[PDB]
Amino acid sequence: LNEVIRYTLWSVFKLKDTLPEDRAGYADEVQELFDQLAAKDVTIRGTYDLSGLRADADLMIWWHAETADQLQEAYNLFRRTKLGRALEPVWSNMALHRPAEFNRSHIPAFLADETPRNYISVYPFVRSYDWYLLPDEDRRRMLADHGKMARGYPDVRANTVASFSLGDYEWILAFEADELHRIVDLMRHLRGSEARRHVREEIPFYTGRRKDIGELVAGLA
Amino acid sequence: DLNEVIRYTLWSVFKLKDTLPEDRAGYADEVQELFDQLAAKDVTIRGTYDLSGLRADADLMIWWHAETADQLQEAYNLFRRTKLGRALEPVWSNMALHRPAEFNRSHIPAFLADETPRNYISVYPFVRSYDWYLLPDEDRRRMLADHGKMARGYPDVRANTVASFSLGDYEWILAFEADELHRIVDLMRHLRGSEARRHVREEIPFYTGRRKDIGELVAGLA
Amino acid sequence: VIRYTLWSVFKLKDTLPEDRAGYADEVQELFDQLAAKDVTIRGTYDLSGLRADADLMIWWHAETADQLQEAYNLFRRTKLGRALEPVWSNMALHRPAEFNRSHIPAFLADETPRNYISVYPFVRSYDWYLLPDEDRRRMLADHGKMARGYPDVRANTVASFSLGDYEWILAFEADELHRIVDLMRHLRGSEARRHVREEIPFYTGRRKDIGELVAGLA
Amino acid sequence: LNEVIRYTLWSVFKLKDTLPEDRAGYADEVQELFDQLAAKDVTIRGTYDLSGLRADADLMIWWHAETADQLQEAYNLFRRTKLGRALEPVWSNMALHRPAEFNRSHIPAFLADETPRNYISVYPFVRSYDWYLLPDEDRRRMLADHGKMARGYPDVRANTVASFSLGDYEWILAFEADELHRIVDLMRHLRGSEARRHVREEIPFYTGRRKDIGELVAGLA
Amino acid sequence: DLNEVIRYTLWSVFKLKDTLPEDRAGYADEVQELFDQLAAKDVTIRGTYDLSGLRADADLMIWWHAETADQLQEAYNLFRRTKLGRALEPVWSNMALHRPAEFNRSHIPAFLADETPRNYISVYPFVRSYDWYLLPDEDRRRMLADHGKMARGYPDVRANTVASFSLGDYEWILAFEADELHRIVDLMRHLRGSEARRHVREEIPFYTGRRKDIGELVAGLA
């Protein structure tokens, strides 16, 4: 299973303005595309309401597929929908699942049968310049201690997917949880790991409520 | 006790797209109607704030809080449909939620304690050093205690430091309330003398302004 | 005691009209009504060409932040204001100096405005205010005496903690522009340059009557 | 071959909204211009689909000529096509092959005229302030040691081209391979090189699929 | 003695809002007329440069200098009123002023010594390290001398490094002219070997282009 090929693309959009007072068929059209996409092996793990938690983000789409190419096609197809034409691209990064350095049983929840949860917290990651230059023992230790420190939070599901030379980052992280504050306390608790001493960048956070494209479109302004 | 409530707090900053119209008759009223309706659910609107002139790309800040984030999201998009909302671009909207303090569980944000909101506010995000939370518990304790001790001469300035890890780009959203603006000024200058200042990576943007009823605010905006 | 001071920077949306008959008078009218209310318009400055995203600055002060907020919105309603984009607007408030209390901003001591200005924000190092008082006393005394040879450059350094993103806002006015330049360069030799995190953006420009300023702008 | 004066320019664009549904002339009119520029010595090594992998890029052009002025003319002409009047410029940096400091048979894989592969990732590069002040031995060793580390990845072609004072950066980098995941593993593997301690900037990344102009015009939204 | 002259130099960079019309009418000529009128008032226009393609956000540069800042501001606003001006938006406009070099009073920017503009320019701002001006004089004097020596193989590249403290965000504006673009590239990479490289905080954006008469500039542009 450390041998699948799967590309994950999280892509974030913001309303150009408000959606129209009459938005009949906006939701349905997008759902239509989401199904014929699901025909091909392009799965839409979730769409997400990001309104109000960020001023420049309103909608997120999590899709994954077997080639980067299929995602690119999906992205452009969405932008042709009547909804995508009322949105502006904001941030859209792709990552690719690779075997973990040490613990080869570490697997992202979207490749481990796990259910999508109510809330998501997505964000890129970039380590210090000498993270990967460290004596393997030091990095395996900090990476293991850091996983211990989170064993109290199995109600928060992790996706931690390599992204080197797919964009500006080293990793794209996604956290799934039914209770939003459990994500908060996880981050807060993990500020205690020694790994925190080897971080260059973890911005921007996009955090939202997983929703059906029907009520998502109705919720948006 | 209050350290066991779940209260999400949201600060939403807007700027005029350009100017309100000359006749702005329905604008404040329609917004007050929405605020009244949000108050029927437990969506409380602690205040609206005039930020114009104190920052070139901010004119209006709504402070609201509620039991789920979803109600804030709902309230937010509902605001953006009002006539006032359609004259405004979003600029900065960040959510936080009270978590128990680490050492002193009697530290409670003012909005949680149902304190009275004051005439002026300064809201700003906050990010600690990378090694702040890794420092041995004794050293973080006496820097957190010493800094609150330095604030004793300013009881008129009411803190609202709230956790925000993974709600957005920051660790903490801070909101200070006082009836005289220069006292916020004087508190920060004085707190520059606390040793915790050596454990700061980020603390901008600042959104400072005057608390106003929605009718007066909509009248005085360009 | 208690004077708030505001520097408001705008840039053209495009150009002004060819026929700009009303524009300067309308603004001068409002400046006159504000001076009645004790909202002082200390100057308007032409910033064009010296920065691509800035064309005019207004320096106004008053007894409360609120009067300035009100003045700022009134100005954005004029014809000239409606032809502008807000770029950078930051307030400060004088507080008595930490060490030498004769040291006060020029515009409180009522000195005349000079021909040119350069306005910029300031943020000191994280540990500047944690230093022993005698160290900060020495560095402030020394940086100030290095400036003895530039008595033609008037300072206005004004605390701005919690009003916006900065700790101080700085305004230098001199009759010859190059004198500001040489002052800056010479002070790069003060030890206090070791305790700086941020000192941009600079807005530098020519003091002009509002009439002359409207006509010269693109 | 370290004597050839060759300027190479990568030009990134993004859609202003979307192309029209009726895009008949679009892909053809561009392909004409490419034919003319190749009649001069303006080689167009590839067009690339960048969409979805970045929210603010959709199309990259990799061109190169004997003179920088030729590329400037090519650029303004392309911006005159119907496809070009449909794009905002996003990022366009030029570089120029100079001999290597130590190993003069390291030469960009594009003036050793090779084959453009399916996938490219392009990004700028700026070294630490003191990298060039290091004793020649130390910089020699690190560049050599980092070259060894990429032996396992010979299906990935390196172009790394000096850029000093043609723009903000010190080099432009382009990596091309037929299997996208191989660029990913190469970057990750190379984070173990000592030269990682002498890096100040390496972004934005532009990664995408080489495509023929007609196929690319049809794919974009 | 050129050290006692006062000469303000301004580089003004613009990008196209979209693309120029097909019918470029007297676009080139209206601008050339204004340059001539400015030339009459001792507003020298050393060069106009094609930036396009080498930077996605710049197509045109104007290098003009004069005896007062004010004259350059007027030139600038007048240029913006031309038909070409109305088809551009400003990107980056910085002014500088020659002041006597710290140690070697013979170092003089090329334009002030009335040398000939070459085919290619690269312009960029510069900001030194915080302690740069605080190093003991002989450390800084040695480092600048050595950096001079390292440039001796490049006399075909002319330097115009000029003080800009307080005129904008920087310490110096630098402008290098050469007849062959690759000589600039090579000088830069060669000077990375100077010790002064350890005392650098900022040196972007770079605007690098080809010197062109207004007419063919306006014609080659998109």
UniProtKB/Swiss-Prot annotation, chains B, E:
InterPro entries: ChdC/CLD (IPR010644), Dimeric_a/b-barrel (IPR011008). The active site is at 124. Pathway: Porphyrin-containing compound metabolism; protoheme biosynthesis. One of its GO terms (molecular function) is oxidoreductase activity, acting on the CH-CH group of donors, oxygen as acceptor. Fe-coproporphyrin III binds at residue 147. Disulfide bonds: none annotated. The keyword Ribosomal protein does not apply. It is an enzyme of class 1 (oxidoreductase). GO terms for biological process: heme B biosynthetic process. It comes from the Bacteria. Pfam families: Chlor_dismutase. Its cofactor is Fe-coproporphyrin III. Keywords: Heme, Heme biosynthesis, Iron, Metal-binding, Oxidoreductase. Fe-coproporphyrin III acts both as a substrate and a redox cofactor. It catalyses: Fe-coproporphyrin III + 2 H2O2 + 2 H(+) = heme b + 2 CO2 + 4 H2O; Fe-coproporphyrin III + H2O2 + H(+) = harderoheme III + CO2 + 2 H2O; harderoheme III + H2O2 + H(+) = heme b + CO2 + 2 H2O. PANTHER family: COPROHEME DECARBOXYLASE, HEME-DEPENDENT PEROXIDASE YWFI-RELATED. Involved in coproporphyrin-dependent heme b biosynthesis. Catalyzes the decarboxylation of Fe-coproporphyrin III (coproheme) to heme b (protoheme IX), the last step of the pathway. The reaction occurs in a stepwise manner with a three-propionate intermediate. Belongs to the ChdC family. Type 2 subfamily. This is Coproheme decarboxylase. The lineage of its organism: Bacteria, Bacillati, Actinomycetota, Actinomycetes, Kitasatosporales.
UniProtKB/Swiss-Prot annotation, chain C:
GO terms for biological process: heme B biosynthetic process. It is an enzyme of class 1 (oxidoreductase). Its cofactor is Fe-coproporphyrin III. Keywords: Heme, Heme biosynthesis, Iron, Metal-binding, Oxidoreductase. Fe-coproporphyrin III binds at residue 143. The keyword RNA-binding does not apply. It catalyses: Fe-coproporphyrin III + 2 H2O2 + 2 H(+) = heme b + 2 CO2 + 4 H2O; Fe-coproporphyrin III + H2O2 + H(+) = harderoheme III + CO2 + 2 H2O; harderoheme III + H2O2 + H(+) = heme b + CO2 + 2 H2O. Fe-coproporphyrin III acts both as a substrate and a redox cofactor. Pathway: Porphyrin-containing compound metabolism; protoheme biosynthesis. The keyword Oxidoreductase applies. SUPFAM superfamilies: Dimeric alpha+beta barrel. The active site is at 120. Involved in coproporphyrin-dependent heme b biosynthesis. Catalyzes the decarboxylation of Fe-coproporphyrin III (coproheme) to heme b (protoheme IX), the last step of the pathway. The reaction occurs in a stepwise manner with a three-propionate intermediate. NCBIfam families: HemQ_actino. HAMAP family: Coproheme_decarbox_2. Belongs to the ChdC family. Type 2 subfamily. This is Coproheme decarboxylase. It comes from Streptomyces coelicolor (strain ATCC BAA-471 / A3(2) / M145).
